[PDB]
Design a binder for these strands. Structure first.
Ligand code: DLU
Ligand code: DLU
Ligand code: MG
Ligand code: ZN
Ligand code: ZN
Lengths: 66, 47, 261, 242, 261, 47, 66, 242
DNA sequence: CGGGAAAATCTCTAGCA
DNA sequence: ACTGCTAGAGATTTTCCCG
DNA sequence: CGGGAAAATCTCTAGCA
DNA sequence: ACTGCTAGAGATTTTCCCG
């Protein structure tokens, strides 16, 4: 039940940006989505990223490669 | 209290100082002689 | 420095020397010279060297009117994906901008439109078109196209494509539609190797799927967490770290000094 | 890797599609595709439909995504080939349009529409369009008073149909349905691309005869030999291109 | 790929898809898609992303004419130091540009002047003024102010200073001279913490001193070096490394496999 | 042999291909239809 | 004689730039000057720098500090 | 550090200036300055001169650097205060001008020239100018035929005088001389700045009484106590500001 | 050797029009 | 065969200064 | 573990007007 | 209370592939 939902929400990749870095950071792992903030995991680090700074996808290219 | 010198709109003359009312990421809201203006942070200095 | 400072202001009142010059010529600490320069109104002539970061929410669209061959092309773009919509219109008028906006809001979920302060976008007819479609209007700081960087950059790619296909069409509207097609479905790259159409499909599909999944997770996973405080609502747990929402404030705490009830 | 046999058994029992198997057992989609393709007892999203409606003396030109009920419509000044080709080129630029169904009318069999189909890569072939006509006219009749011209009414009607009326098994609107179906098509195209890429590779493991390649993992290499899928270590198999 | 390539050129002839799109849609290696895009004339629309580097020899000066309050200000700059000379002139004419150039060449050692292709700089009267003073003329690539970056940047600092002191002078020529003074002697910073005047003095004084010193060293230190070749002329030795000049080609060789005679 | 596509002077239309005659640091000399031109390397592509 | 001249020519500082780096490199030590090329020593490394890329000085601020 | 005694002996023998000592023995210039300042038996570049010459009916206004013979001259339309102040402000912007000598003429004692001197920081005081007048007129008479106006001739004359005629002990031209003298002045100003900075610091070493500070090295601290200069390790002395 | 403060270095931007 | 740069504002790293 | 080649990442620029 | 960005060209670092 719940565990399948959690490992499904964690399959989505997140590209984000910090408040002073113009470059987009690589695909993170979505842990929690909210109305104004998303909780991600980039390289064994948990960051909180506002909704206006994040692009969440799923990469269908990758879901099909592995 | 902060002094703000800014460059408002299609005008090369810098104006100021104005009161700082709100500092955001990339833009700031000031008050220059009972006139509220929004100026990006590329066009303002805060002291 | 009382003798060295008084001479520095007297020299600055004439030449407006920077802090380095007044520190070298009057034996001043850098803080004192910087203070003297910072109190001079005539020397505050430069802003800070950064850039802002535009909104890239899934519902954010940027619109702008661009000109080519004497015709007006109204261009829209989905900021999160780069998917563009465009249309040659006979006049920069609130009527046809509202028509374009209603068409766009009918084809895609448009939550907020970001535009500059052109007369066509600030018109009372667009306001009614945004109010009926439930769209929120976010106008930029006047005379700052950087606030519309996504669409302004899209005004360049679209023009660049039109010149590549301008000899395959008699009229400019046909070339504009060819360019929209080419950008949206024949140019790959970006944050997924996608094209603009594939990418936009990914953003909305992901938005709905994640909203439903998180709704289910929050419906099932219902815990309260005490750390160090009040019963913060649990958001996520695992890998020796806990993420919670205490009074509408998301913070990350380690598994230690945190109990889940 | 370890659940290939469980997947094979579940398919021989329930005849499940590869998507569930890749989701339930955590298998690369290529392997599940080969599971469903190994049994002979187990064997649309680019299809738009075009028609022209008359209302209040102007010609409305409607486009319907059959799989989803999503409607693209706008009022055109004349029932001519110029405007039909313009509309269809616009549509091909917005959504991936692969084949359009028409009623062999004069404006649909012109040379301009045919050239627009050739350029956009659309196939032309000459009852959902009638029901969608009826529903769109119903909604226009509802919402007409809220506008002065008819084009604006039509667009408000298209917005209402696409995003405000919901139904079906899950209660989704036409916009969500179209997004979902196009995303599934993207998944299918990517899977076909990857299968086509791997199909020109032969694997020699432990040496044994050549075998078809399915997956190239970080700790294993999945191969199909004599209609049987086996797992071998990367160091125990050499992959060549033919 | 014979079937996959032939369809890719046919699709590129219509949409001009980039290498990524043609690699994903037709199963092509990146090199093949890049080759197909590279053979299309209509797709070569972007130059390479770098910048050049202007000449900063001690004898290099950059001149340009700038406008302010309807008057013409002829500005010069010493590239190596940033020391500027300026003058309000009634007209952009080769006569007064030649006058300014002769004055400049009489006050400082000017070996070469770099200018854009304005009519006043490309005039036959300036050519005579440069020929008499032994100055070499280096014109930039037309319509590329980047080739004059030093002076163009100096057109901005000079204007910025003039506005700071414009209310201390009735006429604009007085303000221009005040600005020249302020830039040259009241603004410190740069590659030595200097001002522009101090820095320029350092460059010419260093040039003469080093020329004399190296003349003496070459007059005394006279050796020939064989390495790995011919008798290369010795330039410097020490710290386990030898620098020599073999047939007008300076190269650095280690002390090993090198003998000094 | 190299093909050079360039942007010569106050003109947004790109021209080419032209023969490469001299590649310097920052600028290049080409030959386009018996016409010798000097174009910076920001305004040229070489293949 | 010659040694004094050599350690005098080595007292001059050189700021230089590489053919693709827009930033000026710190003060090196002048070893040899020529009409078109200067030989310097930056951080125990011997580089050859053209005359048009180098700005040789002496820093009178420093000669007087030490 | 080690040659302070050798420097002191060489000065008590030959009365050498601090520059040679800092160059010959490798001493920080402050220490050599204190050596030359410790003996009581051992005890211009901003000085320009201004005059006006008449030739062919126009007024030439000449400026001479006394220390170097470097000439700044140009033809002005009228012998007035406006133009004199403009010329002097120009000169003050080009070179460091600290005091100007004049012949108390009407155009030199105006209010405009005085205000220009006040703004530029120049001191006003009311036979080298006459000899330079004669030489400049000589050169103008040589070179007049090569020009049509007189201003151009004057400028060519100034160029020839400043950079083509050489003489003196070393055979240098006026331009090289001015550069050298201004560089020596820069050295002197920097040394004075550093001495003024260090003079407000007191050192307690090994504790002994306070001493004047001279140098703050990377392996030593040089101090002067009771008219005697001693070297102490940095860890063996504490520096305080007074 | 250890923090804190001050200095030096780094990064980045407008305007030159 | 020729060529972006300069100075200031804020951030971040180094160095020094006394323990 | 060791090179080489190919892929991925990084850096940087015009144009949007 | 709001906000530069995008895609391509060349350079440099990573990853993989067979020994
Ligand atoms: C009359 C409306 C309202 C009032 O302002 C004007 C002027 N303007 C100027 C540009 C322009 O030159 N952009 C180049 C650019 C520069 C910097 C940046 F960050 C982004 C950029 F796109 C436009 O594109 C544009 O649409 C307008 C416009 O619409 N208006
Ligand atoms: C008629 C002459 C000869 C033919 O060309 C024109 C046009 N032009 C244009 C600028 C200008 O817009 N500079 C801004 C800028 C942009 C980029 C850069 F790298 C450096 C920069 F300074 C000038 O300054 C200038 O002097 C001229 C000029 O003199 N002429
Ligand atoms: Mg110019
Ligand atoms: Zn000031
Ligand atoms: Zn092409």
């Amino acid at each position: 039940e719940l565990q399948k939902q959690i490992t499904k929400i964690q399959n989505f990749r997140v590209y984000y940006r910090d408040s002073r870095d113009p470059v987009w950071k690589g695909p993170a792992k979505l842990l929690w989505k909210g109305e104004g903030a998303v909780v991600i995991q980039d390289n064994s680090d948990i960051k909180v990223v506002p909704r206006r700074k994040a692009k969440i996808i799923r990469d269908y290219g990758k879901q099909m490669a592995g | 209290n902060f002094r703000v010198y800014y460059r408002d709109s299609r005008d090369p003359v810098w104006k100021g100082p104005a009161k700082l009312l709100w500092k955001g990421e990339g833009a700031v809201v000031i008050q220059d002689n009972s006139d509220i203006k929004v100026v990006p942070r590329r066009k303002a200095k805060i002291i | 420095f009382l003798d060295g400072i008084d001479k520095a202001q007297e020299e600055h009142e004439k030449y407006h020397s920077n802090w380095r010059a007044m520190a070298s010529d009057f034996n001043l600490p850098p803080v004192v010279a910087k203070e003297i320069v910072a109190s001079c109104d005539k020397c505050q002539l430069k802003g800070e060297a950064m850039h802002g970061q535009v909104d890239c929410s899934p519902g954010i669209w940027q619109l702008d009117c661009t000109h080519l061959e004497g015709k007006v092309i109204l261009v829209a773009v989905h900021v999160a994906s780069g998917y563009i919509e465009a249309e040659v219109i006979p006049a920069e008028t609130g009527q046809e901008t509202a028509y374009f906006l209603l068409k766009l809001a009918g084809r895609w979920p448009v939550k907020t439109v970001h535009t500059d302060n052109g007369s066509n976008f600030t018109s009372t007819t667009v306001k009614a078109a945004c109010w009926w479609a439930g769209i929120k209007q976010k106008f930029g700081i006047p005379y700052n196209p950087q606030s519309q960087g996504v669409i302004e950059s899209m005004n360049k790619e679209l023009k660049k494509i039109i010149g590549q296909v301008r000899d395959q069409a008699e009229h400019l509207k046909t070339a504009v539609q060819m360019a929209v097609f080419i950008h949206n479905f024949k140019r790959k790259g970006g944050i997924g190797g996608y094209s603009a159409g594939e990418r936009i499909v990914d953003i909305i599909a992901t938005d709905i799927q994640t909203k439903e999944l998180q709704k289910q997770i929050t419906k099932i996973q219902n815990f309260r967490v005490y750390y160090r405080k009040g019963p913060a609502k649990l958001l996520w747990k695992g890998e020796g770290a806990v993420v919670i929402q205490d009074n509408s404030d998301i913070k990350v705490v380690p598994r230690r000094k945190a109990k889940i009830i």
